[PDB]
Every structure is written in C-alpha cells, then in structure tokens.
C-alpha cells in the first residue's frame, strides 16, 4: 500500500525562561524514527527506531546540522509572527510545522505537504500542485507574497519530489521488517450487563499496525450510530494500536448486533457476533 514520511516540529516561546523550546519528530506512517529536543543534553538528532541505526554516521551529523537550522529559523519565525499579529513579548506562543511526501506501493511520488500553524490555527500551506500557497489570514498573505517572490514553492517541490521520496524509499527498505509489516487486528467481543434490562457489547481490535482501521455496528444488517460509542485509536506502546466500539443493547437481543472490522492486514472484513 501507500507510505508517508512526515516531520512534525513544535516551537514554544517562554519569555523570561530562555529561548523557545524546539521539538522535532520524524515518522514513516505510524512509526517514529527520529527526534530532536533543544532542551536535551545530546544536542543531536536521535534514533527512535532500531532500523534508522543502519544509516551511516554521516547521516547523524547531516540531520543534526539541518534540524538545528530549522530550530534557529522557527525561533526567528516566532518573533516575526509576533510582529505580524502585533502581540506582546509577555505571552507564550506556538509555531508548528509539518512536511513530507507520500509514495504508492510502486514507490512513485504521490503527494507533497508543507504547512504551518500559529497558536494551533492554520497559518500557511503548500497546495497539492506544489506550485502555490493557501494563507489563512492577512499575516499569512505577507508570508505568501515573500515566498512567491523568493520561489519557495519551487525549492520545496524539488525536495518533496526528490530527497524526501529517496529517503522514504531507503527507510522502507532498511526497516522493511517493521514498516512494511501488516499486523491484522486480533478481535473479540466482551459483554457487560448494565442492569437486568440492558447490556453493553464491546467490539475489540488489538495488536494492529498500521493504525488506520474502521469498526462499525449493525442491527439486523443496518448501520447503527445510536447508543454507539467509538474511542480514539490508541498506541499499545509496543508499536501496535488498539480500538473498540460499543453498543448498549436490549438484554436478550444481543444476536441482532454484528460488529464489522476493516483493516489493511485483513484479506477481508471480519463480522463478529455475540458468542457465549
């Protein structure tokens, strides 16, 4: 199937408490592989997946250089955002950045991304064509014009269609055991009386990778979102994911209810029913 590489960066100002904190984190699909934290002693980009330890030592020096340049740049971008929004130096603010590339199962470039958020709101994003920018407000329109004038879309396109995909494909090979695995969910159903009169049926998907999954309830084979609870997909901490979906049911009518599990690792959707 398709694969994604994503770098996520967070810069947080803390006036009177030193320079902003910069955290960067790198992912391939739902698996983290690097970090950098300007507060940590190493002052190095660090591995967070076994397979990235195969990169040579030159890699660690190069990524450390570049993430430090990102750092110094987003520290200044916090001060530029202050000016544009006309805000005091007394308050803490957040600049988030995301970028990276998608490839098909053939390994060909699919899609490129490069976007910012200020104080948790969309600021600017590179559009699908990788030739143009969406700006959320007049401050981002200042950035949009600067970046058009300086051909920023062209520099970022050449990275996303080039080095980015090269990197993602090398990672997919060096970490094939991890990244290209497909762990189907292990599913079961639990039953929890609420009363003499009603019970919760809970449908479980455990140990699955990657994290994309769909859990659906039906009653007599028609979709059910009434009395349905669906929790966020959640990490187990071992590189796999968990999810459940629940219905409260008239006790003695359990068998009307089917749970349906869709996941890349199942050759076919699963139907679960209540089995004493």
């Amino acid at each position: 199937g398709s694969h994604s590489m994503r770098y996520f960066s967070t810069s947080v100002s803390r006036p009177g408490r030193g320079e902003p904190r910069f955290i960067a984190v790198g992912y391939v699909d739902d698996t983290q592989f690097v970090r950098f934290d300007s507060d940590a002693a190493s002052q190095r980009m660090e591995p967070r997946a076994p397979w990235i330890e195969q990169e040579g030592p030159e890699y660690w020096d190069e990524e450390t250089g570049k993430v430090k340049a990102h750092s110094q740049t987003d520290r200044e971008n916090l001060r530029i955002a202050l000016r544009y929004y006309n805000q005091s130096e007394a308050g803490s603010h957040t600049l988030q950045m995301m970028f990276g590339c998608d490839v098909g199962s053939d390994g060909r470039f699919l899609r490129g991304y490069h976007q910012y958020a200020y104080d948790g709101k969309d600021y600017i994003a590179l559009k699908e064509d990788l030739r143009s920018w969406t700006a959320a407000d007049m401050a981002a329109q200042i950035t949009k014009r600067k970046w058009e004038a300086a051909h920023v879309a062209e520099q970022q396109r050449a990275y996303l269609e080039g080095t980015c995909v090269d990197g993602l494909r090398r990672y997919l090979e060096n970490g094939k055991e991890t990244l290209q695995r497909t762990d189907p969910p292990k599913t079961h159903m639990t039953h929890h009386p609420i009363s003499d009169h009603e019970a919760t049926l809970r449908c479980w998907a455990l140990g699955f990778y990657p994290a994309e999954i769909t859990l659906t309830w039906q009653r007599d084979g028609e979709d059910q979102t009434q009395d349905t609870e669906l929790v966020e997909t959640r990490p187990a901490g071992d590189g796999t994911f968990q999810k459940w979906a629940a219905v409260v049911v008239p006790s003695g009518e359990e068998q009307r209810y089917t749970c349906h599990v869709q996941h890349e690792g199942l050759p076919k959707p699963l139907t679960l029913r209540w089995e004493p």
């Binding site: 570049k66 340049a69 987003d74 600021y123 600067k146 990275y159 090398r170």
Partner: peptide, 9 residues
C-alpha cells in the same frame, strides 16, 4: 531525511 532550506515567515 530533512531538507536543507527552511523559510522565514
């Protein structure tokens, strides 16, 4: 693998 250039707002 990171890019070399990071733009100013």
């Amino acid at each position: 693998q990171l890019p070399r250039l990071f733009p100013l707002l």
